[PDB]
Ligand binder design. Structure first.
Ligand code: A1AYA
Length: 209
């Protein structure tokens, strides 16, 4: 059972801008998603400070980067607080409508796309490099769900029957044909060292073969 939803008009306009604007500094997508992951790990850590059973779904707090050249996917896995179904609808737990508003006035006032994270909509920078994004998530208070969108004004949500996650979020980037450099080990290491050197959780870059 798959449910199809329309993006709010402002979010559709944000993704079309991300997709269509000429902007060469695409690598910032990884910084934004890792920062999103760190924020979600912060949230479950804070909750566990007064309720340790919140970590019964997993004590380890980490970020994994999993490239797969055969599938042409880069997957960012974290064991953060995760998202409810209601969170996935309602723009993956963001205040994306007001964030897009502020972002788009900043762009007309001199800002560039790299500053997207300052407006709380950094997730959508995934579409700098991805033709399709799948988000698998598990929150302690809900079941495991799969969100998916190839942009074009709509997204789907369905119950995820795949491999259980315990708790956290998995962002699967189905990369554009000309963006496969972000599957190369040395390129990912360079981006992580450049932009994510002060993330307070272990970031593990998986290798292939
Ligand atoms: C609500 N916060 C915004 C960033 N988040 C997010 C959104 C979509 C995909 C992945 C993530 C990170 O786990 C969760 C934390």
């Amino acid at each position: 059972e798959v449910e199809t939803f329309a993006f709010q008009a402002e979010i559709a306009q944000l993704m079309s801008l991300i997709i269509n604007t000429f902007y060469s500094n695409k690598e910032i997508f990884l910084r934004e998603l890792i920062s999103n992951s760190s924020d979600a790990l912060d949230k479950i850590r804070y909750e566990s400070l007064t309720d340790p059973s919140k970590l019964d779904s997993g004590k380890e707090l980490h970020i994994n980067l999993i490239p797969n050249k055969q599938d042409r996917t880069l997957t960012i896995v974290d064991t953060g607080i995760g998202m409810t179904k209601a969170d996935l609808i309602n723009n993956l737990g963001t205040i994306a409508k007001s964030g897009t508003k502020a972002f788009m006035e900043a762009l007309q006032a001199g800002a560039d796309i790299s500053m997207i994270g300052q407006f709380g909509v950094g997730f959508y920078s995934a579409y700098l490099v991805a033709e399709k994004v799948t988000v698998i998530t598990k929150h302690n208070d809900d079941e495991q769900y799969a969100w998916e969108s190839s942009a074009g004004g709509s997204f789907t949500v369905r119950t995820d029957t795949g491999e259980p996650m315990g708790r956290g979020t998995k962002v699967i980037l189905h990369l554009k044909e000309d963006q496969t450099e972000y599957l190369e080990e040395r390129r990912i290491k360079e981006i992580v060292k450049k932009h994510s050197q002060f993330i307070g959780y272990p970031i593990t870059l998986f290798v292939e073969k």
